[PDB]
Design a protein around this ligand. Structure first.
Ligand SMILES: CCCCCCCCCCCCCCCCCC(=O)OCC(COC(=O)CCCCCCCCCCCCCCCCC)OC(=O)CCCCCCCCCCCCCCCCC
Ligand code: HEA
Ligand code: HEA
Ligand SMILES: CCCCCCCCCCCCCCCCCC(=O)OC[C@H](COP(=O)(O)OCCN)OC(=O)CCCCCCCCCCCCCCCCC
Ligand SMILES: CCCCCCCCCCCCCCCCCC(=O)OC[C@H](COP(=O)(O)OCCN)OC(=O)CCCCCCCCCCCCCCCCC
Ligand SMILES: CCCCCCCCCCCCCCCCCC(=O)OC[C@H](COP(=O)(O)OCCN)OC(=O)CCCCCCCCCCCCCCCCC
Ligand SMILES: CCCCCCCCCCCCCCCCCC(=O)OC[C@H](COP(=O)(O)OCCN)OC(=O)CCCCCCCCCCCCCCCCC
Ligand SMILES: CCCCCCCCCCCCCCCCCC(=O)OC[C@H](COP(=O)(O)OCCN)OC(=O)CCCCCCCCCCCCCCCCC
Ligand code: CUA
Ligand SMILES: [Cu+2]
Ligand code: NA
Lengths: 103, 93, 48, 72, 85, 54, 227, 44, 514, 46, 139
């Protein structure tokens, strides 16, 4: 079910021996699913990207959530508004003010 | 009698493959390989002569699309979807 | 910084006027017999 | 101040099922439009032809034209 | 050096010889059936007979004198034979 | 005669397999190319005269 | 007769042809159903901004995805077998008439009593009467009476043709050495136009069949009027 | 499919030359036969 | 050196390149023949005077685009190019008969042109109906030249089929079975089976018609006990299997290109995909008399054959739903070949639906040898199959040359075909509804509207093939190379680079032990 | 050994754009014009 | 020479994180900003943020998946060579085609018009249906 789905995803993203290649594989096969990812899953991905220092892949998966919001753009405000403590204790900003949302 | 046997008649590539068969070796891929091991300490070994090699992994059971990629002589690389490990080894003389 | 910003609209406008002009020419100016439907406005007359 | 929880999962699934329902309803609408346009008018025009149609009298009124090879 | 267990076929003009030989034979049959010639027929029959002759001589040469016929290739040959028959 | 014919063939000299014999096989080679090319020229000229009316 | 800017098929004359065009229109709104389905699916399928490239299971669509085409094709095919039953129905042989495809033209025979055979050709464009159809008018039109089951007995002399009347909607293939029976009924007077319908040489477009519905009393007056 | 820039970037005029050449090399043969059709029809 | 590499070739890549160039040859000859037909049929009256010449050019049209480019790319060139590059084969098992097939194709082409050069002219249509092709109506050599050209094309297809099945089973790595591989294997496998199980009937037919003509047997002549229905039955027993030969490799390549450009890592419903393929191959033999709905056959046979055509229409619908399922839910990048794919699926769908309408038996009785049948097979094979052909041709053009093709001109071309073939062949639909028989040069006056607008559409097809000659020229002129290709992990054929080298797969593919 | 590369694995040389243009135009001109010359030949014969 | 060996960059939203970076060559100050990136995250400003993004990967989705005028220019080219096609029609109508048959004159088409109206050809829906036989004028 979705509960054990998200549980195995957060354990996969919070294993201590994560590196960029296998988190890339996990994120790509997460994108391949038919779902907007859970904010807890995005939170775990941001902790992993904090652990091995990937600003650009982190903002890339943020804008991946943005383009996965689809034809309606209310999902991304929800995702960020649970992500506000996480962004300001990792110090990361999102493209909507760091200047990649536009052309 | 009068009918010759393989060890006196069959020559060339027949000789290498038949002597390899009677010693129980497959140096020219007549049979599927063995020693399946996807773990870190025991990767999947691929014999070769060159730096460069094709692999195609059926990396889940009863799969449609074969995951093909390229092995180089160097560090072990893995399937991008399942996670079976691969090394190249230069001894297929 | 591409071809489709301004050359694209130039090509679409020029091709538009060129194609509509030559197709009104083919439809009307030669006067080929299309053998249109003679209903409505085309009238017959008597024969033996 | 705060936002409610919208759909994360099954979004394309509900989109596709409502769109194939729309596909079925627009297909039956297209067929009903084609029917009401041309199909039963064929049946009708045959009916008002043949309920009062008299084929022999039809034969005389193109026979006064004097066209028939068998009828001079 | 090759690593696969399959016979690498070297370039051959025998396809060209067989192709124009078959064309000559077909032209002979129609030329005889419509214009009564014999010489082109004799040329066509001789060139097919020789073409398959040293074609199959080349086949035996690469088969038993070279040993390229790995049993994978041999069972492929049996597949070709049963499909032909 | 199989092993001596085999070591007669595999000199590893790089010439293709239809030129393992020497002069007689190139003799037959050259005469078959000559006869097949002459045959196809004679076919094309015969078809051209068949095309042209009398 | 065919008219310019003809959208659909010829209007039916025979009752079998009115049934045939009813089944035709049945197939037509069926094909418009499925064409509307594929267009709406492809439009609202390409206009989607959502991706799903995971392993979606495929062994869950078999039963519905195979029973819906099965039922739609079976209710297509049931009127087809029914109309084949009205193809091979029992005839009441009111009249017979033979035709032969002679070499690029037609021949017609009434051999029931005072045997009559005649040949029909194409009236040329230069020799056309003022006010006749191009490529259709024939110096000897074949003439048949009102509302009688009449069997065309078709054959051909030296090359197979096809007796083809789209204004009665029947085309039947005149094989040499083999006569085929095709019954016709009609209910409306006048001229009815067709062709032959397989390739048979260098005047293939130049061989029509024009058929004249008259009352049977005037038909027998005609038959007495030739001979 | 990522691709390198054209090794030989055909200039504005060059493209026209190739385009016209194809059109001309195709229309001329057909038109030539069609133009002489009237004399052809005539049986001598 | 050139005579060794390209004349004396024993490699499948260069044999496929030769196949592609010969197919371009035959395709241009065929479109010129179709333009001769369309220019004669543009105006009421006779452009060519006698229409015996019209019959000769329409049967040349039929022969050249049924036998001389469609197998050469779609089965021949695409097959021997890609099948080793996706199986793992270093080469053909049977390259000398790959070379039989290719190098006996131009003798067949030359004998067909010789049949045209014959004073009589083989004016019999696509099919070789006796006694139209008999000793009296066609007393001449042209029919015999066509018969021997079809002999050479037939044996070309036999040896190609033997090579393709031998490669498609034998070259496979042993651990992977037939159900572990993508759709090229199953597509060319089932089509080579259909070649092998259909072509000998055609060869038999042309042989006994040949001895009917020349050395005087009476197999089809009813004056001494023959029957034309014999040749009819056997020739359509060939014809519809050859039809599904003309439709299935397009299915395989179109599924591959839809999976590629929809971004799918795996084509959905693969088991159902291959099941539909083998169902079509296994059932296409016993549906041949759907052309027999008006000859005089028994109504039990007619009912059985129309039921069988419904049953063969079922897995085509499975195929279409499988295509849409593959297209479902992906990153839809707008490649020109994906547009070719959309045009193929929609227009082939409506053509096959018109065929279902035809296979309604009494609808065939009113619509036999009619322009509606033309509208059928001219949406289906004249344009559906070739849309698959250009989709593959612009899809694997770097694999074939090493250079890319210009997408702007490519999709503008998909538009120019789109409008051209619609305005060409939908009027034929109108014409078949009006109801004239096929093989006509002069028509009644009421058909002028649709005839003229189809003539304009055919000239649109002319300027389209001019864009083909142009874009191949400019692609060769720019000769720009790729730097990266997508989905090479799931595409074996793109792994060796663009183009693949002379010796590919020297070391065969390593496979999982499982 | 055979030498490979992009474009040079094709039977016609791609060494010059103008020469390749000339070869392609004359080849495809012959291909397009062959059945025109055919139908011309039979209407000469008839 | 061959570059299918090393995994290749390809930016698309289906595989949104490619395995390999865009600019593998890294300068001295670029190495300095990379080790500062490896350091604490509270001292990074917007311009080096966007420059490190653009030097590790090429494009971002919100500026690459944009609808350009490529559809405009290709439909323009399509109907532009449609215009050239119409010019070809003009040329071939002027030079290739001969006279119309005499069967299309206005008096002659009136002759057959009266003919098939007198025959009541397809009088149900097709042609004679739109004609009245009482007032002798089209409906
Ligand atoms: C090697 C060094 C150069 C040797 C001389 C090359 C030129 C003469 C020659 O022998 O040239 C070689 C011949 C080869 O042709 C034949 O042999 C004709 C067989 C029938 O060239 C032709 O005759 C003309 C070909 C014209 C261009 C055709 C383009 C086709 C495009 C569509 C297919 C693309 C496939 C991509 C893949
Ligand atoms: C590739 C070529 C091709 C293909 C696929 C087909 C496919 C079919 N053909 Fe056709 N056919 C030809 C090529 C082809 N044909 C040719 C060349 C001739 C001329 C021979 C001659 O000269 O006499 C011919 C002639 C021909 C006739 C001859 C008419 C006559 O006697 O004059 C008939 C009639 O039965 C027929 C029927 C069919 C049917 C029923 C199919 C089916 O297989 C169609 C299947 C394809 C589909 C796309 C199905 C669509 C259905 C769905 C998508 C399911 C969804 C629908 C619902 C849910 C209702 N064909
Ligand atoms: C594939 C087969 C094919 C193709 C493409 C076509 C294409 C066309 N056909 Fe076809 N036609 C037949 C097969 C084909 N036809 C057959 C089998 C018959 C029956 C003959 C008979 O009656 O006996 C027939 C009959 C036929 C008639 C007979 C009607 C009659 O005489 O009563 C007419 C007339 O309108 C016609 C017209 C056309 C037109 C206008 C095109 C246009 O679409 C022309 C456009 C074609 C192309 C654009 C070709 C595309 C190919 C390439 C671009 C090359 C690709 C190669 C590489 C990329 C390497 N055809
Ligand atoms: C009722 C029986 C019938 O013929 O219905 C026609 C159609 C449903 O089709 P049906 O015949 O049931 O089977 C599929 C083949 N047409 O059913 C219809 O076309 C429905 C007609 C009524 C509803 C029309 C809604 C139009 C909306 C705009
Ligand atoms: C594209 C859709 C799929 C293919 C359909 C092919 C069949 C077709 O278009 O038939 C023409 C159809 C029937 O014509 P019909 O309406 O009966 O004409 C007489 C009274 N108007 O006529 C129509 O449907 C109306 C005209 C064409 C509309 C499209
Ligand atoms: C007219 C023929 C000469 C056109 C010369 C010209 O303007 O060339 C510039 C350009 C070259 O093409 P380019 O923009 O590089 O390619 C399209 C991108 N896929 O040309 C084009 O893009 C086509 C311009 C057509 C103008 C009409
Ligand atoms: C006339 C046609 C004759 C065809 C024929 O005899 O082909 C010879 C072919 C030779 O064997 P092949 O496998 O091509 O050898 C190279 C790889 N060892 O033989 C074979 O490949 C096996 C037999 C094929 C028979 C085909 C006959 C047609
Ligand atoms: C008469 C019919 C003519 C059809 C001509 C079709 C030309 C298509 C040109 C093209 O490439 O369109 C793609 C374009 C969207 O592509 P792109 O800009 O990359 O997407 C990013 C955001 N949309 O634009 C589109 O996707 C919209 C147009 C799609 C047309 C599809 C036609 C299918 C048949
Ligand atoms: Cu008689 Cu066609
Ligand atoms: Cu069939
Ligand atoms: Na004409």
């Amino acid at each position: 079910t979705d509960e054990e789905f998200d549980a195995r995803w957060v354990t996969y993203f919070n294993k201590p021996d994560i590196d960029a290649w296998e988190l890339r594989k996990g994120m790509n096969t997460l994108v391949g699913y038919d779902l907007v990812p859970e904010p807890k899953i995005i939170d775990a991905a941001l902790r992993a990207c904090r652990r091995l220092n990937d600003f650009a892949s982190a903002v890339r998966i943020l804008e991946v959530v943005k383009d996965k919001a689809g034809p309606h753009k209310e999902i991304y405000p929800y995702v960020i508004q649970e992500l506000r403590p996480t962004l300001n204790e990792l110090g990361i900003s999102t493209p909507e003010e760091l200047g990649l949302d536009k052309v | 009698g009068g009918v010759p046997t393989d060890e006196e008649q069959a020559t060339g590539l027949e000789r290498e493959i038949m002597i390899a068969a009677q010693k129980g070796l497959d140096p020219y891929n007549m049979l599927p390989p063995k020693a399946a091991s996807g773990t870190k300490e025991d990767p999947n070994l691929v014999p070769s002569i060159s730096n460069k090699r094709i692999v195609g992994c059926i990396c889940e059971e009863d799969n449609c699309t074969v995951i093909w990629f390229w092995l180089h002589k160097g560090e072990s690389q893995r399937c991008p979807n399942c996670g079976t490990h691969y090394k190249l080894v230069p001894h297929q003389m | 910084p591409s071809f489709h910003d301004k050359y694209g609209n130039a090509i679409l406008a020029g091709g538009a006027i060129f194609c509509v002009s030559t197709w009104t020419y083919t439809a009307t100016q030669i006067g080929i017999e299309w053998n249109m439907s003679p209903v409505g406005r085309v009238t017959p007359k008597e024969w033996r | 101040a705060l936002l409610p929880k919208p759909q994360m999962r099954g979004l394309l699934a509900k989109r596709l099922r409502v769109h194939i329902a729309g596909a079925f309803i627009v297909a039956l609408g297209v067929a009903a439009a084609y029917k009401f346009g041309v199909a039963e008018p064929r049946k009708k025009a045959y009916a008002e032809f043949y309920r009062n149609y008299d084929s022999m009298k039809d034969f005389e009124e193109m026979r006064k034209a004097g066209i028939f090879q068998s009828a001079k | 050096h090759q690593t696969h267990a399959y016979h690498m076929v070297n370039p051959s003009p025998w396809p060209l010889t067989g192709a124009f030989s078959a064309l000559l034979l077909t032209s002979g049959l129609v030329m005889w059936f419509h214009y009564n010639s014999i010489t082109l027929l004799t040329l066509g029959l001789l060139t097919n007979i020789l073409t398959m002759y040293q074609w199959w001589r080349d086949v035996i040469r690469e088969g038993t004198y070279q040993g390229h016929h790995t049993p994978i290739v041999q069972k492929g040959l049996r597949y070709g034979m049963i499909l032909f028959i | 005669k199989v092993p001596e014919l085999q070591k007669f063939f595999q000199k590893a000299d790089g010439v293709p397999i239809h030129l393992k014999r020497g002069l007689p096989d190139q003799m037959l080679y050259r005469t078959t190319m000559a006869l097949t090319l002459g045959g196809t020229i004679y076919c094309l000229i015969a078809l051209y005269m068949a095309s042209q009316p009398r | 007769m065919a008219y310019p800017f003809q959208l659909g098929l010829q209007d039916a004359t025979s009752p079998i042809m009115e049934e045939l065009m009813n089944f035709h229109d049945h197939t037509l709104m069926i094909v418009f159903l499925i064409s509307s389905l594929v267009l709406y699916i492809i439009s609202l399928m390409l206009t989607t901004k959502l991706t799903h490239t995971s392993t979606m299971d495929a062994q869950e669509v078999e039963t519905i995805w195979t029973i819906l085409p099965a039922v739609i094709l079976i209710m297509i095919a049931l009127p087809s077998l029914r109309i084949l039953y009205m193809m091979d129905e029992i005839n009441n042989p009111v009249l017979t008439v033979k035709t032969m495809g002679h070499q690029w033209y037609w021949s017609y025979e009434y051999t029931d009593y005072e045997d009559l055979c005649f040949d029909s050709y194409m009236i040329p464009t230069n020799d056309l009467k003022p006010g006749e159809l191009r490529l259709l008018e024939v110096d000897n039109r074949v003439v048949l009476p009102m509302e009688l089951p009449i069997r065309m007995l078709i054959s051909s002399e030296d090359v197979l043709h096809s007796w083809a009347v789209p204004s009665l909607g029947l085309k039947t293939d005149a094989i040499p050495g083999r006569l085929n029976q095709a019954t016709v009924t009609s209910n409306r007077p006048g001229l009815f136009y067709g062709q032959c319908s397989e390739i048979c040489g260098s005047n293939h477009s130049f061989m029509p069949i024009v058929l004249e519905m008259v009352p049977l009393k005037y038909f027998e007056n005609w038959s007495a009027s030739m001979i | 499919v990522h691709s390198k820039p054209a090794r030989e970037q055909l200039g504005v005029l060059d493209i026209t030359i190739g385009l016209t050449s194809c059109f001309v090399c195709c229309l001329l043969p057909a038109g030539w036969v069609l133009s002489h059709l009237e004399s052809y029809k005539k049986r001598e | 050196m050139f005579i060794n590499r390209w004349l004396f070739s024993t490699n499948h890549k260069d044999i496929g390149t030769l196949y592609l160039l010969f197919g371009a040859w035959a395709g241009m000859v065929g479109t010129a023949l179709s333009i001769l037909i369309r220019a004669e049929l543009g105006q009421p009256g006779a452009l060519l005077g006698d229409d015996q010449i019209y019959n000769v050019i329409v049967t040349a049209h039929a022969f050249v685009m049924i036998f001389f480019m469609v197998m050469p790319m779609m089965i021949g060139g695409f097959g021997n190019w890609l099948v080793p590059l996706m199986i793992g084969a270093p080469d053909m098992a049977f390259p000398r008969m790959n070379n039989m097939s290719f190098w006996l194709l131009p003798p067949s082409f030359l004998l067909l042109l010789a049949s045209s050069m014959v004073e009589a002219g083989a004016g019999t249509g696509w099919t070789v109906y006796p006694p139209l092709a008999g000793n009296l109506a066609h007393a001449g050599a042209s029919v015999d030249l066509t018969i021997f050209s079809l002999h050479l094309a037939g044996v070309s297809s036999i040896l190609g089929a033997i090579n393709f099945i031998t490669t498609i089973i034998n070259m496979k790595p042993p651990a992977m079975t037939q159900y572990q591989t993508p759709l090229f294997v199953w597509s060319v496998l089932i089509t080579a089976v259909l070649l092998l199980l259909s072509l000998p009937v055609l060869a038999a037919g042309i042989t006994m018609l040949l001895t009917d003509r020349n050395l005087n047997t009476t197999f089809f002549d009813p004056a001494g006990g023959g029957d034309p229905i014999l040749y009819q039955h056997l020739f359509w027993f060939f014809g519809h299997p050859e039809v599904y030969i003309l439709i299935l490799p397009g299915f395989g390549i179109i599924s591959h290109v839809v999976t590629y450009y929809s971004g799918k890592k795996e084509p959905f419903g693969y088991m159902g995909m291959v099941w539909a393929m083998m169902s079509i191959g296994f059932l296409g033999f016993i549906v041949w008399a759907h052309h027999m709905f008006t000859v005089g056959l028994d109504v039990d046979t007619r009912a059985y054959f129309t039921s069988a055509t419904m049953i063969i229409a079922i897995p085509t619908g499975v195929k279409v739903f499988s295509w849409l399922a593959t297209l479902h839910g992906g990153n839809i990048k707008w490649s020109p070949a994906m547009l070719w794919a959309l045009g193929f699926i929609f227009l082939f769908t409506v053509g096959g639906l018109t065929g279902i309408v035809l296979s309604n038996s009494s609808l065939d009785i009113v619509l036999h040898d009619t322009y509606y049948v033309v509208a059928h097979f001219h949406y289906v094979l004249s344009m559906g199959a070739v849309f698959a052909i250009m989709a593959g041709f612009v899809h694997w053009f770097p694999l074939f040359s090493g250079f890319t093709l210009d997408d702007t001109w490519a999709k503008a071309h998909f538009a120019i075909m789109f409008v051209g073939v619609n305005m060409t062949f939908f009027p034929q639909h109108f014409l078949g509804l009006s109801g004239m028989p096929r093989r006509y040069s002069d028509y009644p006056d009421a058909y002028t509207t649709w005839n003229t607008v189809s003539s304009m559409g055919s000239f649109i097809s002319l300027t389209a093939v001019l864009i083909m000659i142009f874009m191949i020229w400019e692609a060769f002129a720019s000769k720009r190379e790729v730097m990266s290709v997508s989905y090479a992990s799931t595409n074996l054929e793109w792994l060796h680079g663009c183009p693949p080298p002379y010796h590919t797969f020297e070391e065969p593919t390593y496979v999982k032990v499982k | 050994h055979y030498e490979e590369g992009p474009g040079k694995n094709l039977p016609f040389s791609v060494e010059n754009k103008w020469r390749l243009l000339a070869m392609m135009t004359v080849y495809f001109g012959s291909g397009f014009a062959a059945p025109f010359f055919i139908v011309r030949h039979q209407l000469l014969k008839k | 020479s061959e570059d299918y060996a090393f995994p290749t960059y390809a930016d698309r939203r289906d595989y949104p994180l490619p395995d390999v970076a865009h600019v593998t060559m890294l300068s001295a100050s670029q190495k300095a900003l990379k080790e500062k990136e490896k350091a604490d995250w509270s001292s990074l400003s917007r311009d080096e943020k966007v420059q490190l993004y653009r030097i590790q990967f090429n494009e971002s989705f919100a500026e690459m998946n944009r609808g350009t005028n490529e559809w405009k220019t290709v439909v323009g080219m399509a109907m532009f060579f449609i215009g050239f096609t119409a010019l070809v029609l003009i040329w071939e109508k002027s030079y290739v085609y001969g006279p119309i048959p005499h069967t299309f004159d206005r008096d002659w088409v009136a002759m057959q018009t009266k003919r098939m109206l007198d025959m009541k050809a397809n009088p149900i829906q097709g042609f004679s249906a739109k004609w009245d036989y009482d007032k002798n004028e089209w409906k």
